[PDB]
Structures are given as C-alpha cells and as structure tokens.
Design a binder for these strands. Structure first.
Length: 767
RNA sequence: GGUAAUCGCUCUCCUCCGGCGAUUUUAGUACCUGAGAAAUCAGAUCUACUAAAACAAGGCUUUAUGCCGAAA
DNA sequence: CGCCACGTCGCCGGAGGAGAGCGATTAC
DNA sequence: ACGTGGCG
C-alpha cells in the first residue's frame, strides 16, 4: 500500500544520501593522502571558479572547493523535464552547462531546475557527458598550466566520481551481509558466506506442473518446438488430420523455410487441393496469427553471415543460453554468466548475441509457463503420438493435487499484495478459533477459496458447503513513524521560545490564510516582518487595491507586471514571495540542536509531533492516586526484538507525572505500593466511571501537558468519535482529566467476543 | 460453468540504481538604519542569492562499489 | 481550564520480475 | 487522524 511505497522511497533516498557522504569522505581521504591539506576557508563563488579553471590556474583551495561541489551534482547518466532536456541539448551543441548556468546567473541570478518564464524551461538536470567533458577540460588546463596534479589523482578521482552500482547487485558487500542484495547472510555447512550472480534470478516463478522447478524462457529451442507442435497439431485440413510423418515433414520444411506461408507449404506436403480451412487464427483486424519459428529464422539469417551452425548446438546449451539472454541485460552480467557456463563461446558469438538481444528485445517477452523437465517429457511423446496438447497433459495426470501437506497436519498458504496477506491471516485465525470452540459444517479470492475448499475437503465425514475482520487487532511493534519530519527553526521573544513557520504567498489557500490573518489584526502584533517597517505597508497597499476573491499578487503581475520587491530608493530590493510568521510555544519536542554544533538542549532547532507507544496506569493502595504515565516512541531503543525502554528516559516521565521526586527512582516504588495495574497500547479497551455510569472506551494516547490526560475512542467504532450536531461529524477529542476519578479497567477481547479482566502485570522492559 | 496453452492490448504490486528539489543551522554579500561628504564602520541580522553541514531520535563492525534503522 | 481551528513533503527518469482484466481463439 | 498552542 502507500505505506510500503513510502518505506521504499525513504530506503532508496537514504541509500543514495549515504553513498554521497561516502563519496565525499573518500574524496577527502584522497586529498589527504596525495600530499595536500584540506583548507579551512571555503569559497562561495564556485561557478566563477569553474570559469577561471577552464583557462587559468587555480589554487589548491579553489580546486578542492570546485571538486567538492562537482561530486555532489554529478548529473544523470544513461513534461517540463523532457523539454528542459531538449533545451540543454540545443544549447550543449556549442558550450557546457557551466557557461549556461553563468548566463542564467547573469540575466536571472538563479540555477535550480524551476524556471517558468509563452514559457521557457531552462533547468539544471543535465547529462553526465557534459560534466565529464567539463572535467576533462579543467584537468587538462590545470595540468598544462603546471599544476601539482598527477595522473594517478585524476584517474582515481574519476573512479570515485563514476561510482554507480548496478541494479542487479543491490546493497551490502563481501563483508556486510544483508538479505537485501547479492551478498547474503545465509551460511552453508562449512560456515562460508553465500554469494549470488543476480538478484532477480531467485524471483522467477515456479513451473505450473512441477512446483519445484524454474520455468523456461519462451525464446529457446524446446519452447518453440513445443509451440509449433501445438499449433500445427490443432489444424485440420480437408477434413483430414495431419499424420505423424506429415508432422515431421512440415516441421522440417518450416524450420528450413525463410518465410512462412503455410497454405502453400501445407498443400505441398499434403499433395492434395484445399477446399476448407479450420484452426486458422486470422485476426478480424487483418493479421494471420501463426506460431512459426521466429527467433530461429532471425538467428539463422544473422549467424549464417559469420557461418556459425545453430544445428551444431546441443539442446541444453541452446536452452541455457536463451535463458541468460532472457534475464541478463548488461554486458558484465552476461559475460559472467557465460563464463559460469562451462561451454566455451567465441567472443564473436558473445558480441553477436548481445547485439541480437539489444536490437530485437521484443522477442524475449517473458518466460514460458512450463519448465524444461515437463517440456522434455512432452515433446518426444508429442512427436511420436499425434494427439492434442491438452489430452497429452492429462495422460500422466501429473496435475493430481497438492494436498499432501494439508493431510499431513498459514505459511503454506501465505507464501502462495501485502494487504490481503494480513486479511487472510486474520480470517484463518478466526476460523481456527471457531473450529476449536465449536462448528465444522480475483487472484487472491481464487487462491483463498481454493485453499479453504482443499482444507475442508481434507477432513473426514465432512459435508461443508462453501458457497461464495478488517484488521482491527492491536499494536505491539517498535520503530514506527517516530516524528513527522519537517525540521523547524525557532526563535525567542520576551523570554519565550516560539516555533516559526514560513507562509507561502503564491498559494491560493495560503493567500487566503494571510488575508484572514492580516484583516483580523493578528499579524502586525507579531515581531516577524516588523524588522522591516516600510516593507510591511506595501503588502497592505498591494492587497486592499486588488483584494477581490483571488490571489492579489497574481493580478499584480497581470496588470502592473512588476513583482513585489523590498523598499529601496534604488529599487534594488530582493523579491518577496514567502513571509515568515510566528506559530507558538513548544512543549513537546525532540532536542536536535546538538547535531548543529550548538549546546546540549539549547532548543535552537526542534522536531515536533512525537508519537505514542504505551501508557502504564499506576495505583497506590495508600490513597488510590492516579499516575497514567505515558510512553512515546522516542524513549524506545529497539530494533526488531529489543523493545527496551531502558532505566533512564523512564524515571523522568515517572517524575514529571508526579510519581517520584528528584531522589526517588524505579526501585523506590514498593514503599508507596506502586506497580502496574495495566499496560495499555494503541487500540486497546479501558473502563471508566464518569459520573458513576461505566463508560467502556478504547484508549488511544496521552496529549497536552495537563497531568492525567487520556484520549478515548468510542468502543463501538473509532470512525464515529462524536457526532455532535445535526449532520456534521466533528473529530471532537475526549481530552479528560483523570486527577479525581476512582476506577479503571481493561477488557482483553479476543475475536470470538470473550472479555478477560486483567490484573497486576509483570514489567515492561522486553528484551 | 471451471482448467491449460498462445497472441495482441490495458491496469496493479515487490525489489534495485540515480537526479532535481524542499526545510533548517552557521558564514558572506545585497536590502534597511545610524556615524560619515562619500568610502568605510558599527548595529539590525527582516527579505533573497551563494557555500557547507543536518535530513526519522539512534545504532553497528564489515573500515568500505560499508551496513541497519518509517508494515507481517 | 476548556474550547477549536491549524496544519502536516513533492516531482522526474531507467530497469527487472510477478499479478490480473479485455478481444480472438484451440481444446478438455 | 491526530498532535498541540492560544484565547476567551
């Protein structure tokens, strides 16, 4: 679902960012080990340094800065994007992208790939060929100008520069075993690591007859033999069926033919006129559907120029080579696969097959359903006995069943969409529960229906009529969405630290937001944009003259044409398109400013909207006080199995909620009779006694700062939180203070519907 | 009805390799305001432009085409 | 202290498997 | 969906 697509985008982005950091670090190491020192003062006018280096000598500092910049924007190697590519192509016939960006700076003062200007589409997404040409020019100029660079440095820098792993290798290396790439963590009997040649190979589907074998590639010898036998076997001519001798002769002729016209060939082999035709699959659109050997004829006409005999090839060698040509698409993988195959190939054949793959890719459309085992079992009996393929399939009746495992006794069905997997898991859980209690009377739909029918027909004396649970559960996992990204920068006003969000003017919704903020007087009181007093009333002047019911700036550039700039006698003011404004205080935050060089917990840069994990109801028998000590996702140091809250970052919430003082700790609880009464997770069940009616409600989380604040959900349905008025469902919250109440209770509820009352739990420092 | 195989045309899922961004902190310049004839200085450090770093909090040993980390 | 309105990340490009659906069919 | 200040 959208969530796994998100997980993927983040994983790929993280891998690319980490590969970029490694690139920069390796460049720094090469700079150190080559006899040069990293400078301390960095230059900002990088592009002008590129222009200088094209012709004139550059210092070590300038060269270091330009190389560091180059390693970050090394371009792409092989709508607005394609049109921008066309413009870079038409401008690259004379010059390199550095000069184009120079001109963009000179006449527009910007570089990035967003240049709506009819409209022109200047951009920054260039091609690696131009960057490499620029690097070659720069390096040659510096070398000819008596620089300190030696050829080893340029060669090694370009080796670092062109770091690009291949899509069929993935992450991990020969010492960093991960199950996401080629170098895996599984160990053999000797303890050595396991190494593959291509990742997609294991993903190939199984055969439809023998479920322990890999399918065949539809471009080989045996595949085309089988398909041409099926096609010519079905045809009926002159109310006579083709005989075995006729089948052999027609196969020999069609293999030996260059262009196929089976009306003519068939009348030649039969030696009899033709009055009627059946089995011919002429398209109503005007195409004569035939299964003649296609890859055969092209391979014959191609390899016969260099005079290489395909008939000299064995069947297994041809099938194997046709499989590798099907899967492996690049030169290196193909060469390694042909090396692994002990058969010896001339380099001419390798190049010949590679160009054949690259020019007629459409032939290798996919994999034939069967495997080579069933195909080799079928073809000889297909040739000897002139019978239809479907009947020959059921002769050995190899499609018996797969009920052996089911009569021996989820994973046997789960293995056969990451959402319906969970759905069917819940279905089978409930079915087992009801079976143990009492009672036994699409692609996914077909699979699940067949599995249920098979399982219920495996039972003895069963007469079940199978004629044709939305992931409620609970949450118990760690390492979920920790925070909501969006790094925030915060400032200070009269001793209070306020988080600052910028407002985009050029968005209609935000244009209306600024409209209602300015008109209500709630903007001028804030000190944002008050640092320029003259630059503020210009907003009002532009606004009230052109208020309307649209974006005032849109009409401003439509009528006047000029944009909005900063007050200046010389009209030198940079354009204003985004205006910051205060948001409010921060109470819940993640202290990050220590990752910017600032002091610990300086709160200069924060991240907001943390997520909850658990809250532990606490009860003392001395007076029955309430301590709904909550826990959030940040306080957990987990990875898969070690859901450890740790000793610290748990007593601090304990103390803030009032359980403990500065001295008392997690061991000073028995003294006041303090221990768990429950352990509530998201989408749990809790009891309440508001006003002495018992309200059984779903616990969600803790919010705000007020002590004993619980958010509740209607037991019945979370999708009906509180419908207050006639026909509106406001998402009203159940912010409630549990400072003065007297009861709380959990009802562990399995799917069958039973309710279990819970008592003093063990502890929560799992692993 | 159901099953297998083919051909052509239209949608979805998983995995991998990259690019352009966006948001922040620090620094420079412009824009503002004082001193100054101006330059330049100090201070504001709001609105942009340019560099570097951060980019789920955090963890590894494999010190590198390094690795994990937002879904059963 | 209790209410209730605000506000939260996008776009491209190359692959390769694996699922379906709709038309023609050949049949069990 | 659901945190998380401000303003009576």
């Amino acid at each position: 679902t959208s969530n796994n697509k998100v997980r993927r985008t983040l994983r790929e982005g993280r891998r690319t960012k980490r590969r970029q950091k490694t690139r920069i670090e390796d460049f720094k190491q090469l700079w150190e080990t080559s006899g040069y020192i990293i400078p301390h003062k960095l230059h900002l006018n990088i592009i002008e340094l590129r222009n200088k280096g094209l012709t004139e000598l550059l210092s070590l500092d300038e060269l270091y800065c330009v190389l560091l910049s180059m390693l970050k924007h090394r371009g792409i190697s092989y709508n607005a994007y394609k049109k921008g590519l066309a413009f870079n192509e038409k401008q690259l016939k004379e010059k390199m992208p550095c000069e184009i960006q120079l001109e963009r700076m000179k006449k527009y003062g910007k570089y990035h790939g967003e240049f709506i200007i009819e409209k022109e589409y200047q951009s920054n997404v260039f091609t690696t060929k131009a960057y490499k040409k620029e690097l070659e020019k720069i390096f040659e100029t510096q070398r000819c100008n008596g620089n300190k660079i030696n050829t080893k440095f340029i060669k090694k820098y370009m080796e670092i520069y062109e770091r690009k792993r291949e899509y069929y290798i993935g992450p991990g290396n020969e010492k960093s075993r991960t199950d996401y790439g080629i170098y895996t963590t599984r160990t053999d009997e000797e303890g050595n690591f396991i190494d593959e040649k291509n990742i997609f190979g294991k993903l190939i589907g199984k055969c439809s007859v023998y479920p322990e074998e890999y399918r065949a590639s539809s471009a080989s010898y045996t595949a085309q033999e089988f398909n041409l036998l099926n096609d010519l076997n079905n045809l009926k001519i002159n109310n006579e069926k083709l005989t075995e001798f006729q089948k052999k002769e027609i196969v020999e002729i069609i293999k030996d033919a260059s262009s196929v016209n089976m009306r003519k060939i068939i009348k030649k082999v039969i030696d009899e006129d033709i009055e009627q035709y059946s089995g011919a699959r002429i398209d109503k659109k005007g195409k004569e559907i035939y299964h003649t050997f296609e890859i055969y004829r092209k391979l014959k006409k191609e390899l016969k120029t260099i005079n290489v005999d395909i008939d000299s090839f064995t069947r297994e060698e041809l099938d194997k080579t046709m499989d590798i040509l099907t899967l492996n698409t690049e030169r290196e993988s193909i060469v390694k696969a042909f090396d692994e195959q002990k058969f010896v190939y001339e380099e001419n054949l390798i190049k010949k097959l590679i160009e054949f793959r690259k020019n007629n890719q459409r032939l290798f459309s996919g994999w034939h359903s069967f495997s080579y085992k069933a195909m080799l079992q079928l073809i000889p009996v297909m040739y000897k006995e002139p019978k239809e393929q479907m009947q020959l399939l059921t002769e050995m009746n190899v499609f018996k069943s797969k009920k052996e495992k089911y009569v021996n006794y989820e994973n046997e069905v789960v293995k056969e969409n990451p959402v319906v997997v969970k759905s069917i898991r819940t279905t089978v859980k409930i079915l087992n529960a009801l079976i143990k209690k009492y009672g036994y009377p699409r692609y996914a739909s077909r699979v699940v229906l067949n599995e249920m029918q098979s399982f219920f027909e495996s039972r003895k004396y069963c007469n079940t009529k199978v004629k044709v649970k939305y992931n409620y559960k609970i949450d118990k996992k760690c390492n979920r969405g920790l925070c909501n990204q969006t790094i925030y920068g915060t400032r200070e006003k009269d001793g209070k630290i306020h988080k600052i969000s910028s407002y985009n003017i050029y968005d209609d919704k935000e244009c209306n937001s600024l409209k209602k903020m300015i008109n209500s007087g709630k903007g001028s009181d804030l000190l944002m944009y008050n640092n320029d007093p003259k630059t503020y009333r210009d907003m009002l002047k532009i606004l009230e003259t052109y208020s309307s019911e649209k974006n005032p700036f849109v009409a401003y550039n439509k009528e006047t044409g000029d944009y909005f700039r900063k007050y200046s006698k010389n009209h030198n003011g940079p354009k204003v398109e985004k205006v910051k404004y205060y948001s409010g205080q921060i109470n819940s935050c993640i202290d990050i400013s220590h990752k910017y060089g600032h002091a610990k917990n300086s709160k200069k840069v924060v991240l907001v909207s943390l997520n909850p994990y658990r809250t532990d109801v606490y009860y003392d028998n001395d007076t029955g006080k309430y301590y709904l000590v909550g826990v959030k996702y940040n306080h957990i140091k987990c990875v898969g199995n070690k859901y450890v809250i740790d000793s610290e970052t748990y007593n601090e919430l304990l103390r803030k909620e009032g359980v403990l003082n500065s001295d008392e700790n997690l061991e000073d609880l028995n003294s006041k009779n303090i221990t768990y009464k429950f352990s509530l997770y998201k989408n749990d069940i809790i009891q309440y006694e508001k006003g002495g009616e018992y309200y059984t409600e779903r616990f969600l989380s803790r919010i705000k700062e007020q002590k004993n604040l619980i958010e509740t959900k209607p037991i019945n349905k979370p999708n009906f939180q509180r419908k207050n008025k006639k026909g509106e469902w406001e998402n009203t919250r159940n912010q409630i203070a549990l400072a003065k109440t007297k009861y709380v209770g959990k009802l562990v509820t399995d799917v069958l519907g039973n309710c279990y009352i819970v008592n003093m739990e063990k502890f929560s420092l799992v692993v």
